[PDB]
């Protein structure tokens, strides 16, 4: 499949490149037009410049349920093995695999061969999860996250067992174009639920920090609903998106990256407008 | 795409899908007359079958499975240059 | 990075004529001219 996979990658990158070019043309026309309509002033740099909406990789989101594989870094800690066990229950149909002396590239080829849709890798620091990598395997995007405030079900006594049904999804706070891009990657990890499902999973954006919450609700009576929090609780902060798979750091391009040493980096946010 | 691209098909598109020019794209040959010549002696096979007709349009799927036939003098030279000749495989 | 990406689409079956790559009378003549 070396020859076939190379051909499909080139045409995919070709179509992606054209979409970016036409959008950049729109922004230049839009920013130029609004400036003169204001009639306030003409920036000198503006003077110098003047003188398939659905993502291509996500063909098959609605037709078939996603298949998710979860693994860790080599020689996992005790608590990291518990966290990967909980993430398996969060995602319907997910599977968790032991990472032995497995090369990263060897994992990706096995996942592609068996039709695994998405691959999750989690890192830890002194027994607490600190990083998460989400990769869409058929040459899809790879997103890199850092975890901030992880609270596990194992820490909390006598919770019980979860509903494990297909949950409803809530996306809140994602307004910019990048935020729309990010929320798509998180949403497509989940299958199409049922209308009468009582399981709710929430992604809420606040100053480029994404909060993950898991809940089940019961309607005792009209207009009054009671929420009981279940499942792990953590925060996500994106810092990089790459076009290729996680076997391709050295060749894939960067769609978006966070730049913290910029003179105005402190006061700027990218997931909201 | 849509029917807009359908108006660009010409004789050039058909000529690009011929077997000798695919070899020239795949860098199996460097000249068209050399690419044509390889075909009739039978050094080129499309999967299990060997094709000797230069007028032969290869599909995208079949393009992945074109290679040198085994026990061919050209394949010996390729293996010799790569220092990967194994006489057990003939 | 540009060199590395070329290696991904490298064809193992690619072939070039450069891959395939004196006489005693001439060799004796050179030695006679040398002396």
């Amino acid at each position: 499949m070396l020859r076939r996979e190379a051909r499909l990658r080139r045409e995919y990158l070709y179509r992606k490149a054209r979409e970016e070019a036409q959008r950049s043309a729109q922004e230049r026309k839009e920013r130029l037009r609004r400036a003169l309509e204001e009639n306030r002033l003409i920036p000198t740099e503006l003077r110098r410049e003047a003188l398939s909406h659905v993502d291509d990789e996500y063909r098959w989101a609605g037709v078939e349920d996603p298949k998710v594989m979860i693994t860790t870094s080599r020689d996992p800690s005790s608590r990291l093995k518990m966290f990967a066990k909980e993430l398996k229950l969060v995602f319907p149909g997910a599977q968790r695999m032991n990472r032995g002396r497995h090369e990263v590239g060897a994992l990706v080829r096995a996942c592609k061969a068996n039709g695994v849709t998405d691959l999750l890798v989690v890192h830890e620091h002194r027994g607490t999860p600190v990083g998460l990598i989400v990769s869409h395997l058929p040459f899809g995007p790879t997103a890199y996250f850092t975890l901030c405030n992880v609270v596990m079900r194992h820490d909390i006594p006598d919770l019980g067992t979860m509903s494990e049904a297909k949950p409803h999804l809530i996306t809140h706070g994602f307004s910019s174009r990048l935020g729309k891009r990010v929320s798509d990657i998180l949403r497509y990890l989940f299958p199409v639920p049922k209308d009468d499902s009582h399981r709710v999973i929430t992604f809420a954006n606040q100053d480029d920090y994404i909060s993950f919450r898991h809940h089940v609700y019961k309607k005792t009576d009209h207009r009054n609903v009671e929420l009981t929090e279940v499942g792990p609780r953590f925060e996500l902060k994106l810092y990089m998106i790459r076009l290729g798979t996680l076997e391709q750091e050295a060749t894939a391009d960067v769609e978006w990256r966070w730049h913290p040493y910029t003179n105005t980096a402190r006061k700027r946010v990218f997931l909201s407008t | 795409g849509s029917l807009e691209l359908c108006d660009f098909v010409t004789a050039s598109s058909f000529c690009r899908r011929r077997l000798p020019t695919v070899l020239l794209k795949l860098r199996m040959a460097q000249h068209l007359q050399a690419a044509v010549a390889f075909v009739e002696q039978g050094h080129v096979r499309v999967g299990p079958d060997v094709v000797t007709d230069p007028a032969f349009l290869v599909t995208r799927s079949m393009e992945d499975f074109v290679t040198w036939v085994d026990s061919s003098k050209i394949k010996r030279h390729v293996l010799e240059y790569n220092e990967e000749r194994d006489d057990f495989d003939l | 990075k540009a060199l590395r990406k070329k290696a991904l689409e490298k064809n193992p079956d690619e072939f070039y004529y450069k891959m395939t790559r004196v006489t005693p009378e001439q060799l004796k003549l050179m030695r006679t001219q040398d002396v």
Binding site: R10, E11, Y14 | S12, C15, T21 | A2
Partner: peptide, 30 residues
């Protein structure tokens, strides 16, 4: 009519031309 056989467009489509132009520019810069 097809182009000359020596031309690279004789055996390349627009997809290959887009990738080859980017590769040629990067290598020529070095």
């Amino acid at each position: 009519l097809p182009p000359s056989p020596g031309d690279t467009s004789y055996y390349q489509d627009q997809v290959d031309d887009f990738h080859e132009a980017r590769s040629r520019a990067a290598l020529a810069k070095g």
